[PDB]
Coordinates of all heavy atoms in Angstrom, one line a residue:
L1 N -42.7 155.5 36.1 CA -41.4 154.8 36.1 C -40.9 154.2 34.8 O -41.7 154.0 33.9 CB -41.6 153.7 37.2 CG -40.3 153.0 37.5 CD1 -39.3 154.1 38.0 CD2 -40.6 152.1 38.7
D2 N -39.6 154.0 34.7 CA -39.0 153.5 33.4 C -39.0 152.0 33.2 O -39.1 151.3 34.2 CB -37.7 154.1 33.2 CG -36.9 153.6 34.3 OD1 -36.3 152.4 34.2 OD2 -36.9 154.2 35.4
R3 N -38.7 151.7 32.0 CA -38.8 150.3 31.5 C -38.0 149.5 32.3 O -38.5 148.4 32.8 CB -38.5 150.1 30.0 CG -38.1 151.4 29.2 CD -38.7 151.5 27.8 NE -38.4 150.3 27.0 CZ -39.0 150.2 25.8 NH1 -39.6 151.2 25.1 NH2 -39.0 149.0 25.2
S4 N -36.9 149.9 32.7 CA -36.2 149.1 33.6 C -36.8 149.1 34.9 O -37.1 148.0 35.4 CB -34.8 149.8 33.7 OG -34.1 149.7 34.9
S5 N -36.9 150.2 35.5 CA -37.2 150.3 36.8 C -38.4 149.6 37.2 O -38.4 148.9 38.2 CB -37.2 151.7 37.2 OG -36.0 152.3 36.9
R6 N -39.4 149.8 36.4 CA -40.6 149.2 36.8 C -40.4 147.7 36.8 O -40.8 147.1 37.8 CB -41.7 149.7 35.9 CG -41.5 149.6 34.4 CD -41.9 150.9 33.7 NE -41.7 150.8 32.2 CZ -41.5 151.7 31.3 NH1 -41.5 153.0 31.5 NH2 -41.4 151.4 30.0
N7 N -39.8 147.2 35.9 CA -39.6 145.8 35.8 C -38.8 145.2 36.8 O -39.0 144.1 37.3 CB -39.0 145.6 34.4 CG -39.9 146.2 33.3 OD1 -40.9 146.9 33.5 ND2 -39.7 145.7 32.1
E8 N -37.7 145.9 37.2 CA -36.8 145.4 38.1 C -37.4 145.1 39.4 O -37.2 144.1 40.1 CB -35.8 146.5 38.3 CG -34.7 146.2 39.3 CD -33.6 147.2 39.3 OE1 -33.1 147.6 38.2 OE2 -33.2 147.8 40.4
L9 N -38.3 146.0 39.7 CA -39.0 145.9 40.9 C -39.9 144.8 40.9 O -40.2 144.2 42.0 CB -39.9 147.2 40.9 CG -40.8 147.3 42.1 CD1 -40.1 147.0 43.4 CD2 -41.4 148.7 42.0
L10 N -40.4 144.3 39.8 CA -41.2 143.2 39.8 C -40.5 142.0 40.1 O -41.0 141.1 40.8 CB -41.8 143.0 38.4 CG -43.0 143.8 38.0 CD1 -44.2 143.5 38.9 CD2 -42.8 145.3 37.8
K11 N -39.3 142.0 39.7 CA -38.4 140.9 40.1 C -38.3 140.7 41.5 O -38.5 139.6 42.1 CB -37.1 141.1 39.4 CG -37.3 141.4 37.9 CD -38.3 140.4 37.3 CE -38.0 140.1 35.8 NZ -38.5 138.7 35.5
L12 N -38.3 141.8 42.2 CA -38.3 141.7 43.6 C -39.6 141.3 44.2 O -39.8 140.5 45.1 CB -37.9 143.0 44.3 CG -37.9 142.8 45.9 CD1 -37.0 141.5 46.3 CD2 -37.3 144.0 46.5
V13 N -40.6 141.9 43.6 CA -42.0 141.8 44.0 C -42.4 140.4 44.1 O -43.2 139.9 44.9 CB -42.7 142.5 43.0 CG1 -44.0 141.9 42.5 CG2 -42.8 144.0 43.3
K14 N -41.7 139.6 43.3 CA -42.1 138.2 43.2 C -41.6 137.5 44.4 O -42.2 136.6 44.8 CB -41.5 137.7 42.0 CG -42.3 138.2 40.8 CD -43.6 137.4 40.8 CE -44.4 137.6 39.5 NZ -45.3 136.5 39.4
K15 N -40.6 138.1 45.0 CA -40.2 137.5 46.3 C -41.2 137.8 47.3 O -41.7 137.0 48.0 CB -38.9 138.2 46.8 CG -38.4 137.6 48.1 CD -36.9 138.1 48.5 CE -36.3 137.6 49.8 NZ -35.0 138.3 50.2
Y16 N -41.8 139.0 47.2 CA -42.8 139.3 48.2 C -44.2 139.0 47.7 O -45.1 139.6 48.2 CB -42.6 140.8 48.6 CG -41.4 140.7 49.4 CD1 -40.2 140.9 48.9 CD2 -41.5 140.1 50.7 CE1 -39.0 140.5 49.6 CE2 -40.4 139.7 51.4 CZ -39.1 140.0 50.8 OH -38.0 139.8 51.7
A17 N -44.4 138.2 46.7 CA -45.7 137.9 46.2 C -46.6 137.1 47.2 O -46.0 136.6 48.2 CB -45.4 137.2 44.9
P18 N -47.9 136.9 47.1 CA -48.7 136.0 48.0 C -49.1 134.8 47.2 O -48.9 134.9 46.0 CB -49.9 136.8 48.4 CG -50.2 137.6 47.1 CD -48.8 138.0 46.6
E19 N -49.5 133.7 47.8 CA -49.7 132.3 47.2 C -51.0 131.4 47.6 O -51.9 131.9 48.3 CB -48.5 131.4 47.4 CG -47.1 131.9 47.2 CD -46.0 131.0 47.7 OE1 -46.2 129.8 47.7 OE2 -44.9 131.5 48.1
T20 N -51.2 130.2 47.0 CA -52.2 129.2 47.4 C -52.6 129.2 48.8 O -51.8 129.2 49.8 CB -51.9 127.8 47.0 OG1 -52.9 126.8 47.4 CG2 -50.6 127.3 47.6
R21 N -53.9 129.0 49.0 CA -54.7 128.8 50.2 C -54.0 127.8 51.1 O -54.0 127.8 52.3 CB -56.2 128.4 49.9 CG -56.3 127.1 49.1 CD -57.3 127.0 47.9 NE -58.7 126.9 48.3 CZ -59.7 126.8 47.4 NH1 -59.6 126.4 46.2 NH2 -61.0 127.1 47.8
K22 N -53.4 126.8 50.4 CA -52.8 125.8 51.0 C -51.8 126.2 52.0 O -51.8 125.6 53.1 CB -52.1 124.9 50.0 CG -51.1 123.8 50.7 CD -50.6 122.8 49.7 CE -51.4 121.5 49.7 NZ -52.6 121.6 48.8
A23 N -50.8 127.0 51.7 CA -49.8 127.2 52.8 C -50.3 127.5 54.1 O -49.7 127.1 55.1 CB -48.9 128.3 52.4
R24 N -51.4 128.2 54.2 CA -51.8 128.5 55.5 C -52.5 127.4 56.0 O -52.4 127.1 57.1 CB -52.9 129.6 55.3 CG -53.9 130.0 56.5 CD -54.6 131.4 56.2 NE -55.9 131.7 56.9 CZ -57.1 132.2 56.4 NH1 -57.4 132.1 55.2 NH2 -58.0 132.7 57.3
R25 N -53.4 126.8 55.2 CA -54.1 125.7 55.7 C -53.2 124.5 56.1 O -53.4 123.9 57.2 CB -55.1 125.3 54.6 CG -56.3 126.2 54.6 CD -56.6 127.0 53.3 NE -58.0 126.9 52.9 CZ -59.0 127.5 53.5 NH1 -58.9 128.4 54.5 NH2 -60.3 127.2 53.2
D26 N -52.2 124.2 55.3 CA -51.3 123.1 55.5 C -50.7 123.3 56.8 O -50.6 122.5 57.7 CB -50.4 123.3 54.4 CG -49.0 122.9 54.8 OD1 -48.8 121.9 55.4 OD2 -48.2 123.9 54.7
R27 N -50.3 124.5 57.0 CA -49.8 124.9 58.3 C -50.8 124.8 59.4 O -50.4 124.6 60.5 CB -49.2 126.3 58.1 CG -48.3 126.5 59.4 CD -47.6 127.8 59.4 NE -48.7 128.9 59.7 CZ -49.4 129.2 58.6 NH1 -49.0 129.3 57.4 NH2 -50.7 129.3 58.8

C-alpha cells in the first residue's frame, strides 16, 4: 500500500484501537 493510503488508514485505526485494562475493569 502507498504512503498515503497506508497512513490514512491508521488514522481510522486509531478510532478502532484497543486501550487500558481499566475501562473494562472500571466498568
